[PDB]
RNA sequence: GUCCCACCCAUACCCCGCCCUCAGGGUAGAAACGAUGCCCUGAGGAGUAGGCGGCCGUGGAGGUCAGUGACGAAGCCUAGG
RNA sequence: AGACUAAUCGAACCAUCUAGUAGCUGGUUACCGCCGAAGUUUCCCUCAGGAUAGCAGUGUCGACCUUCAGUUUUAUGAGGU
RNA sequence: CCGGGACCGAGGACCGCGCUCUGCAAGGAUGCUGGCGUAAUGGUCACCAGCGACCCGUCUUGAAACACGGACCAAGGAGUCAAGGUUUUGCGCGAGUGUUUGGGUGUAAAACCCGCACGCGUAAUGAAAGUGAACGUAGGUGAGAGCUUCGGCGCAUCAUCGA
RNA sequence: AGAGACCGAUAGCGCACAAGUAGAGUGAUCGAAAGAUGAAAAGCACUUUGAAAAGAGGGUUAAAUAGCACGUGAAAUUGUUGAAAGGGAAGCGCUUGUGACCAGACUUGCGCCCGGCGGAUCAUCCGGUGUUCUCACCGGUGCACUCCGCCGGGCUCAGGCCA
């Protein structure tokens, strides 16, 4: 007897792309080349965040790097490991460089229209390998519809499973001390 | 595809993992909404609160084509003009001409505001206007007028 | 560009028409692969520059890849054959694989091909004959 | 020729682990197979009864899928297929199909004796 | 009879599919990989000049 | 009934060899690699109901081995490997 | 006499609805590897049955924050065996 | 500090730590010698001998049971398909997305092309008539990966106070 | 009339065959089993034994190990021949022994020197061609002490099994 309560116990984060993008396994390479061998953490960051999925890859938009290119960061590099999308409520767009996993068209359209260039992942690992003068950034995990109907239950104001909405469907009963109780 | 699945891991093991004093017979429990108040009130009200009851009046052959007005903000409004001229009245270089766009050619009845407006003067024909978006339209240099 | 040899590897990694994979062992039928082993090292067939060995009737036959004309097969080979001395062949063929950094790790791999096939075209001497153990007394009658 | 010096072979085990019940029935096999009784004596690891298959059997990897001679079996249909041992002949040794023909039989050994490869089943 | 014979898939997906062949067909070493013939031919986009 | 010496053996403890699982490192101005590879170090291995992963076979379809065959394909028997 | 009505009668025989429904018996097909339970809470014309909470597996993400503990010590409260 | 006996030999150019320092017992066995080169060593099968070993499947707290099914062999033999949901993995486009009801064309049940509407999403809330999302650089406070001219700026997310 | 990622004689319609047939029930109705010699019957003339059926010879054929019980002919079960065990079961696991049978490895390789023999030019040089543009090839020149094979002798090294 050895008294221990876990054994064999395995990692909990990804290790490898479940993708099979040639490409992607190219750009691994790389990276796993670049943490390994060079001392900077967005590296290894970087890479980590070149693992995850699409639902844990959200969208940004040039909205949210506007946001975040005030205050002294307009000469900073952004850096987003997922997909930019064009903003219609935004009539202007700012100069700025942008380094991104791919670009919409309208998105691209827009920024070499400002003024601006965008680069690759390749291009960004070739000019600033080490990361300098750069900020990474995410887009919003919760912004999602399916999160909306995690754990619902009693007095969590979660939204609920109906196959249409009206006067008809749920209300009544448990909703309104008119009939019966209210939640 | 069936050379993936489930059921073909199962092989070689008695009860096809379904368990052993608890057989899966046919229809334990009921068929369908069976025992909504009586034995399946637990899912029924932690899940579902609001089955039982009646709200609010009745309404004889109804017509939804009374009840059709889409609705488009103010922020998108200059999004309805085509990207070359957009690009020249926002460059700014007419200073004396403006646009009229007609909102019921583009399928919009109802015109609400919600964000904030350019200082370009314009006109738009809607069915309905809100009140914040007269007053934003006004505060721009320009005016809506109803056209039915 | 968007096409280089390690994306050709990628592609034709997990399979092509030139793999004969099988239990104890894999092996590939290319004819600008040395050893026969499947490997990025030694797939001729994907990288630019490659070395090839084939018999003639009487000696060697190397062929090696123009990086020139990848557009053009039909002059994309660069092939002469050495039928004077083996030691002679082997330095050729050790200087035209090290002298130039042209595909210098296959230095050993190229020689040893050319001794091999050197060594296969002498007159096989006569076997000797088998021998019996249990069964020589059931002939003894 | 004589194969390259390796370590020792050891086996660990030369049964065949045989299936329980087997020997008094006509109708089953001796191809193991798993017993999924609630009161089986063997899967229940009883003294004095048959063992059962483990990962702990397992051989070395440098002897592994290796004939007590040296070599690793590689099975052949023709003389086209025999060429690519010309790298290999004190690592692997041949074996022609049981399909090929006498005089393919008699062409690919005339082509393995100038290579040098050992053939296990030429005497026919 | 009526389980699901035909599947339905994007008609972008479609271009992009026919798109990847057409830039693959002009890699000779995918052609020598593929099992063809090819040691014997000038350029590998082969044009004929309308003599057909 | 009490005390004191020597001695026998478990799948238990110590040392060594081998198998698998998990965890931590090294490998490109590439003389380079089934990079899903190789090398170094440490710990662990019982199990019904049940969960997941990897692999072996059977009938058909597309591509490829310019595959085997009436000088014998498939099938069957065989205290022969 | 609940007797007889083609060896069938306390409601004949033949085909169809019909593959009638079953909280109840019986069975449920190759291999290896890793993890690994419960007969307990609440409601039901409920007690040979279900939902609900609990135990378990798999897929993960953010830290690696340094965070925690079926444990000891010191200071200070409650209890009616 | 000197004897006696047993089991084992993993690794495969040098690199390191050391000593009694022309060298060594110091990051894992080498040297000399004998017989035989075949049934000798080794493997399969049958039998005698020493020790061990209750009949499978199943319900059950408990089965070798005086609990049930099974005389023997060959072939057949049991979680499938459709519609509608839900979460997760891969892919395309992205504030938009979906060609195939239909038309053109064709080497003809294949492939390719075409367009008005329409479905879901972009705005909610009330039984209903109805109304309809910026005081601020789209807010303040405490934590936050990362970057930095070293002062600071601070994604995602959690908590909290406001609009 | 044209087709199939459909089934392949216990399957596919109940029926691949004189199948809604044979057969059962007074009747309404119920309802099977059964494909394959060989390319061509060339389907064994004749002799002999026998009451007959049959047998042995002898014939046709590539084959009668295809003979109208006819392609291939597995298991349950049975006969003969060969080997072995048995004092109220048999079967099985670990480890030797006896008896029967058997797969591997081994039979040398490498290098050097000396001599014999046959050779045919080695280095060098210049002309042309290709190329990784500096290395290669081809055309001629060499001249015994170069290179290249064959044989005999010697030497060193390593190579099977048990100790
Ligand atoms: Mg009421
Ligand atoms: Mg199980
Ligand atoms: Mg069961
Ligand atoms: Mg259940
Ligand atoms: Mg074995
Ligand atoms: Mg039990
Ligand atoms: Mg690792
Ligand atoms: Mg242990
Ligand atoms: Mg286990
Ligand atoms: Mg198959
Ligand atoms: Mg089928
Ligand atoms: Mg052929
Ligand atoms: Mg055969
Ligand atoms: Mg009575
Ligand atoms: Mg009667
Ligand atoms: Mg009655
Ligand atoms: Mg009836
Ligand atoms: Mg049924
Ligand atoms: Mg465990
Ligand atoms: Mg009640
Ligand atoms: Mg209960
Ligand atoms: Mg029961
Ligand atoms: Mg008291
Ligand atoms: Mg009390
Ligand atoms: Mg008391
Ligand atoms: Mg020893
Ligand atoms: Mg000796
Ligand atoms: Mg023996
Ligand atoms: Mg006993
Ligand atoms: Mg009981
Ligand atoms: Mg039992
Ligand atoms: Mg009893
Ligand atoms: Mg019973
Ligand atoms: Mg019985
Ligand atoms: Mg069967
Ligand atoms: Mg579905
Ligand atoms: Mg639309
Ligand atoms: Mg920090
Ligand atoms: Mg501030
Ligand atoms: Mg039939
Ligand atoms: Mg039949
Ligand atoms: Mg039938
Ligand atoms: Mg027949
Ligand atoms: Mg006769
Ligand atoms: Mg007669
Ligand atoms: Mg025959
Ligand atoms: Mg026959
Ligand atoms: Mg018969
Ligand atoms: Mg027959
Ligand atoms: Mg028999
Ligand atoms: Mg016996
Ligand atoms: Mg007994
Ligand atoms: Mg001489
Ligand atoms: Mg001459
Ligand atoms: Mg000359
Ligand atoms: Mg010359
Ligand atoms: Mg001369």
Redesign the pocket.
């Known amino acids: ?2 008294d ?1 309560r ?9 290790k ?6 040639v490409y ?2 190219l750009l691994v ?1 790389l990276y796993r ?1 670049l943490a ?2 060079t001392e ?3 590296n290894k ?1 970087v890479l ?2 070149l ?6 890859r959200p ?1 940004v938009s040039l909205s ?1 790097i506007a946001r ?1 290119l ?4 307009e ?2 590099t952004v850096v987003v490991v997922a ?1 930019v ?5 935004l009539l202007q767009v700012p100069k700025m460089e942008v380094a991104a996993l ?1 670009f ?4 691209r359209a827009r920024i070499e229209a400002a003024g601006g260039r965008t680069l690759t992942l390749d291009q960004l690992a070739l000019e600033k390998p ?14 999602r ?2 999160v909306k ?1 995690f754990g619902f239950g009693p007095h969590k104001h979660k939204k609920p ?1 109906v196959r249409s ?1 009206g ?1 008809k469907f749920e ?1 009544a009963r448990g909703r ?1 001390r008119s009939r019966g109780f209210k939640v | 595809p ?2 993936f ?25 009921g068929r369908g909404m069976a ?1 909504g108040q ?6 029924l009200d ?2 579902h609160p609001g089955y039982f009851g009646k ?3 009745r309404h004889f052959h109804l017509l939804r084509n009374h ?1 059709w ?3 488009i ?1 103010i ?1 998108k409004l200059w ?1 309805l003009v085509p990207s070359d001229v957009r690009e020249q009245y926002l460059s700014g270089q007419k200073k004396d001409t403006a646009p009229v766009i007609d909102l019921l050619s583009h399928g919009y009845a ?1 015109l ?5 407006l350019p200082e370009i003067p314009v006109v738009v024909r809607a069915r ?1 206007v ?4 007269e007053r934003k339209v006004k505060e721009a240099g320009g005016v809506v007028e109803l056209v039915a | 560009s968007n096409v280089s040899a390690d994306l050709i590897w990628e592609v034709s ?3 092509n ?1 030139f793999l ?1 994979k099988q239990r104890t062992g ?1 092996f590939s ?1 290319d004819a600008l692969n040395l050893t026969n ?6 797939a001729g067939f994907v ?1 630019d ?1 490659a ?1 090839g060995i084939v018999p003639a009737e009487k000696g060697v036959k190397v062929i ?1 890849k ?3 004309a990848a557009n053009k097969p039909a002059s994309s080979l ?1 092939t ?9 062949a082997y ?2 063929i050790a ?11 296959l ?2 791999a190229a020689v040893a091909r050319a001794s091999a096939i050197l060594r296969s075209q ?1 007159p096989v ?1 006569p ?2 004959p ?2 019996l ?4 007394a059931r002939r003894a009658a | ?2 194969a390259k ?1 390796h ?1 020792p072979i050891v086996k ?1 085990r ?2 065949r682990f ?1 299936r ?2 087997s ?5 089953l096999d001796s191809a ?10 063997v899967r229940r ?18 002897t592994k899928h290796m ?3 040296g070599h690793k079996a590689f099975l052949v ?2 003389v ?1 297929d025999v060429e690519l041992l010309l790298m290999h002949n004190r690592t692997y040794a041949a074996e022609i ?8 039989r008699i062409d690919i050994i005339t082509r393995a004796k100038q290579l040098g490869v ?1 053939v ?2 030429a005497k026919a | 009879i ?3 014979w035909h599947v ?9 599919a ?1 798109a990847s062949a057409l830039a693959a067909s002009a890699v000779a070493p995918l052609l020598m990989a ?2 063809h ?1 090819v040691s014997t031919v000038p350029e590998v986009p082969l044009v004929v000049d309308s003599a057909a």
């Open positions: 007897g050895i221990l876990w054994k064999h116990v395995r990692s909990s984060h990804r490898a792309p479940k993708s099979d993008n992607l396994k390479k080349f390994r061998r900077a953490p967005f960051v980590r965040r693992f995850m999925s699409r639902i844990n969208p949210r975040n005030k205050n002294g960061n000469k900073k997909t999308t064009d903003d219609n409520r791919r919409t068209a309208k998105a080490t990361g300098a003068n750069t900020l990474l950034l995410r887009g919003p995990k919760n912004a519809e399916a109907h499973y909405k006067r209300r309104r | 069936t050379r699945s489930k059921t073909r891991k199962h092989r070689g093991h008695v009860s096809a993992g379904k368990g052993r004093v608890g057989k899966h017979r046919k229809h334990p429990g025992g009586h034995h399946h009130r637990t899912n932690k899940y709200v609010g009046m009840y007005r889409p609705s903000n922020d999004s109802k609400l505001g919600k964000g904030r309905y809100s009140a914040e978006a | 990694r997990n399979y028409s004969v894999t039928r082993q499947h490997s990025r090292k030694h990288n520059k070395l090696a123009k990086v020139k660069y002469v054959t050495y039928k004077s001395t083996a030691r002679k330095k050729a200087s035209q694989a090290a002298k130039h950094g042209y595909r210098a790790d230095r050993q002498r001497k076997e000797p088998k021998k153990r249990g069964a020589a | 020729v004589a010096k370590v660990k030369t049964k045989m329980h019940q020997d008094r029935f006509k109708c193991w197979r798993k017993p999924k009784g609630i009161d089986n004596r690891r009883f003294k004095g009864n048959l063992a059962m298959p483990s990962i702990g059997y397992g051989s070395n990897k440098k004939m007590p001679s249909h023709n086209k199909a049981h399909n090929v023909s006498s005089r393919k050992k296990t089943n | 009526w389980r699901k339905k898939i994007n008609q972008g997906q479609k271009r992009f026919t593929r099992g013939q």
